Amino acid sequence: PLTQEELLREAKITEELNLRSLETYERLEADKKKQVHKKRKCP
Amino acid sequence: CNMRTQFPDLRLIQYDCGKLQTLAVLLRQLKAEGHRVLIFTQMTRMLDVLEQFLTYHGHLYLRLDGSTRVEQRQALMERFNADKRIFCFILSTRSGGVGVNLTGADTVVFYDSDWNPTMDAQAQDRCHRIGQTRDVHIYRLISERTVEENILKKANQKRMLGDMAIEGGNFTTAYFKQ
Amino acid sequence: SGAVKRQGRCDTYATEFDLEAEEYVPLPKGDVHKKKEIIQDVTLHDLDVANARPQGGQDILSMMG
Amino acid sequence: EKRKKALDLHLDFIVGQTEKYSDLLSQSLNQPLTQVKTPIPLLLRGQLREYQHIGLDWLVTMYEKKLNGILADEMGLGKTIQTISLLAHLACEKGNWGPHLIIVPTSVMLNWEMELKRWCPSFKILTYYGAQKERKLKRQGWTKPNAFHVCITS
Amino acid sequence: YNEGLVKRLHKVLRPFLLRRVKVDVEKQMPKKYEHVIRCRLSKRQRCLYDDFMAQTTTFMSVINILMQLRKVCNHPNLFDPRPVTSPF
Ligand SMILES: Nc1ncnc2c1ncn2[C@@H]1O[C@H](COP(=O)(O)OP(=O)(O)OP(O)(O)=S)[C@@H](O)[C@H]1O
Ligand SMILES: [Mg+2]
Numbered sequence: 001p002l003t004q005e006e007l008l009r010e011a012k013i014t015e016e017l018n019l020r021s022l023e024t025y026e027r028l029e030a031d032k033k034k035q036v037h038k039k040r041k042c043p
Numbered sequence: 044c045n046m047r048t049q050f051p052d053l054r055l056i057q058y059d060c061g062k063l064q065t066l067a068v069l070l071r072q073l074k075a076e077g078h079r080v081l082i083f084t085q086m087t088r089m090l091d092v093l094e095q096f097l098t099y100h101g102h103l104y105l106r107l108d109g110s111t112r113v114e115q116r117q118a119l120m121e122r123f124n125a126d127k128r129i130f131c132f133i134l135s136t137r138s139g140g141v142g143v144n145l146t147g148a149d150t151v152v153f154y155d156s157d158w159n160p161t162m163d164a165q166a167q168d169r170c171h172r173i174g175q176t177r178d179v180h181i182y183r184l185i186s187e188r189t190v191e192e193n194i195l196k197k198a199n200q201k202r203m204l205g206d207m208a209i210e211g212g213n214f215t216t217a218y219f220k221q
Numbered sequence: 222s223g224a225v226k227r228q229g230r231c232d233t234y235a236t237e238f239d240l241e242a243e244e245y246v247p248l249p250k251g252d253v254h255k256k257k258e259i260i261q262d263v264t265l266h267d268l269d270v271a272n273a274r275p276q277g278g279q280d281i282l283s284m285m286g
Numbered sequence: 287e288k289r290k291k292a293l294d295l296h297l298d299f300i301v302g303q304t305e306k307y308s309d310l311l312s313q314s315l316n317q318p319l320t321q322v323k324t325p326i327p328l329l330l331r332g333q334l335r336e337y338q339h340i341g342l343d344w345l346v347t348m349y350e351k352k353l354n355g356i357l358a359d360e361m362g363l364g365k366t367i368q369t370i371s372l373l374a375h376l377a378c379e380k381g382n383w384g385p386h387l388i389i390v391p392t393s394v395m396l397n398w399e400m401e402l403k404r405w406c407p408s409f410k411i412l413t414y415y416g417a418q419k420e421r422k423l424k425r426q427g428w429t430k431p432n433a434f435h436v437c438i439t440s
Numbered sequence: 441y442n443e444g445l446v447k448r449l450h451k452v453l454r455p456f457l458l459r460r461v462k463v464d465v466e467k468q469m470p471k472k473y474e475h476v477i478r479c480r481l482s483k484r485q486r487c488l489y490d491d492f493m494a495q496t497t498t499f500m501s502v503i504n505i506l507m508q509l510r511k512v513c514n515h516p517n518l519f520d521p522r523p524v525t526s527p528f
Binding site for chain 5: 047051056060064082084175179181182184185193194195208212216218
Binding site for chain 1: 381383409
């Protein structure tokens with residue numbers, strides 16, 4: 001029973017939330033990949 | 044030790060299979076010219092025998108046999124694409140899914156052919172996909188006067204059927220507009 | 222027989238160095254412990270020699286003899 | 287003898303109906319303003335290639351003509367992107383926010399969720415992975431209108 | 441070859457199927473070539489192949505024989521490795 005404008009506003013809010021989630025997932029994956037490639041020794 | 048126990052010579056692994064002899068010649072040529080090879084086989088025990096043959100000949104290899112854990116598959120892909128020493132990457136045609144991006148190699152060797160040419164096409168596309176900057180050569184090894192010739196004939200018949208059915212028509216919007 | 226044979230450094234370590242002076246061998250693909258039944262062709266003379274000039278103990282006395 | 291004639295007439299009838307459908311699709315696609323009828327979705331928030339835009343137009347034409355179809359684009363051409371663009375177009379212009387079901391292989395499920403979040407963050411994405419208790423918990427209250435827009439499942 | 445039937449099938453499938461090959465779409469694409477190399481069997485492989493083809497005529501069906509022949513063509517070590525010989 002909702003109208004199009006309400007759907008658009010809810011879409012805006014959910015878009016903000018999903019962008020936050022996507023950014024967090026990208027950061028976690030990039031950090032994990034960067035940490036995997038590390039390899040060092042000791043003097 | 045030599046008088047106490049005798050092991051079969053590692054050389055006899057290649058002597059007992061003509062595919063292995065032809066593959067040894069082909070792999071030596073490919074390494075001389077400076078390429079990287081993907082070897083696809085339908086059997087994991089064949090993967091083990093290929094491990095023995097490659098280690099005997101000195102070709103460093105990585106393995107994805109369809110039983111490896113998923114988190115290990117991406118690591119193997121990244122290592123193979125990053126490391127230039129790894130000559131070969133033995134794989135099972137039915138495994139790997141579609142998310143594997145093996146653009147590092149430039150040569151594909153099918154140790155044995157699948158009944159379904161789509162699976163071989165996916166194995167080829169594993170290396171021929173977009174973003175790959177070298178010519179791709181596909182080598183198919185077939186045993187003379189054996190069932191493998193029947194397998195290749197069946198695969199070619201299926202490819203011809205696909206070309207008749209789907210590739211025959213343009214199936215694009217250009218036909219509707221024209 | 223207590224016969225130990227070293228076949229090689231595992232293939233997984235074949236990339237660590239460029240010149241190691243090692244022969245690499247793939248990982249065994251069966252079980253760790255195997256039992257195989259085989260047929261041995263021997264003669265009575267072979268048994269006599271094995272029990273007259275023993276070399277199965279792997280001790281110092283066998284080498285000395 | 288009569289069997290061949292019956293099969294021929296049945297196949298002729300099927301071919302005639304299919305030709306009518308194809309003619310309707312051709313007439314729908316030929317509407318003038320290269321001359322792509324459907325604009326990009328305002329919610330799409332991404333750059334499509336030309337052939338992806340053509341595929342979006344074809345999908346919208348199939349939706350309007352009420353025909354189901356197979357998108358057999360070769361690997362890497364962006365079939366998932368085309369599907370997401372179709373859903374965004376329908377939701378924005380048509381109002382088809384309605385619950386859509388996307389059945390994908392389990393390995394590709396996370397990638398599809400990633401693509402939906404990348405292109406269309408507006409859609410309320412529900413993912414159906416987990417054990418029985420987790421699936422039942424994530425179901426609870428999903429019959430409510432405007433509770434989830436697209437569901438991904440294996 | 442009856443091209444009319446093929447055209448009728450194309451007409452039937454036309455309104456529903458959309459196909460695009462990378463050749464016509466992604467132009468900046470490297471070429472591909474396919475080579476077929478014939479290989480001969482070893483003495484061990486030939487003996488095992490003949491033994492299986494003899495087992496065709498007698499409990500093993502054509503499918504089991506087919507799989508065994510595929511394994512033989514792959515490598516005879518899939519059946520039994522060459523023994524490690526040691527004293528009794
Ligand atoms: N317009 C675009 N802009 C940026 N990336 C794009 C675009 N179109 C496609 N891609 C990328 O293309 C890749 C493949 O997308 P998909 O739609 O999954 O292709 P595909 O047809 O599904 O391949 P398969 O068959 O699933 S392996 C993804 O990494 C997308 O990010
Ligand atoms: Mg896909």
